[PDB]
Amino acid sequence: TDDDAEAICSMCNALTTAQIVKVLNLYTPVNEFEERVSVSFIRTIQMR
Amino acid sequence: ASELYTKFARVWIPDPEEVWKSAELLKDYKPGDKVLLLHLEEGKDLEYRLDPKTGELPHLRNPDILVGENDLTALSYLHEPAVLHNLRVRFIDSK
């Protein structure tokens, strides 16, 4: 959720946006339940 | 094999607009069956007809947990639409 996205943006102050967008882009679901990151979430992170 | 094809499976139908389109398998698979019920990605159930003489059952879509892996050979059901889907995901979804 983007409501969590804003909190992540607030807390991830030390790391620059480049590493943040990269790590979100390259995230992998190790187990079945986990799902890939939405492109809309990426856009929200980038714009915020 | 017949064991692989079950209910709520995913297979790739060759199509003109998209070379291979994913499709659900609502109907249970029947060995030597001429036609099967398949749910289209559009949402409209399609009674796609199989060729029992020469045609083969469509390639099984690999589980999405395997999608996004770096190695193309890492996919279980290894075939052209699987590779196409994986590379499309990596180029677009994974940038």
TrEMBL record, chain B:
Domain of life where this protein originates: Eukaryota
Designated name of the protein: Unconventional myosin-Va
Family indicated by similarity: Belongs to the TRAFAC class myosin-kinesin ATPase superfamily. Myosin family.
All copies of domain Myosin N-terminal SH3-like, residue ranges: 6-58
Subunit structure comment from the entry: May be a homodimer, which associates with multiple calmodulin or myosin light chains. Interacts with RIPL2, the interaction is required for its role in dendrite formation. Interacts with MLPH. Interacts with SYTL4. Interacts with MYRIP. Interacts with RAB10; mediates the transport to the plasma membrane of SLC2A4/GLUT4 storage vesicles. Interacts with FMR1; this interaction occurs in association with polyribosome.
Function: Processive actin-based motor that can move in large steps approximating the 36-nm pseudo-repeat of the actin filament. Can hydrolyze ATP in the presence of actin, which is essential for its function as a motor protein. Involved in melanosome transport. Also mediates the transport of vesicles to the plasma membrane. May also be required for some polarization process involved in dendrite formation.
